[PDB]
């Protein structure tokens, strides 16, 4: 991965975009 942002803090957001989503 890009560390873009440090890809952890990315992989958080999506995870937590998807825990509201489903």
Excluded: S
Aim: proline share 5%.
């Amino acid at each position: 991965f890009v560390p873009i942002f440090t890809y952890g803090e990315l992989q958080r957001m999506q995870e937590k975009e998807r825990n509201k989503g489903q």
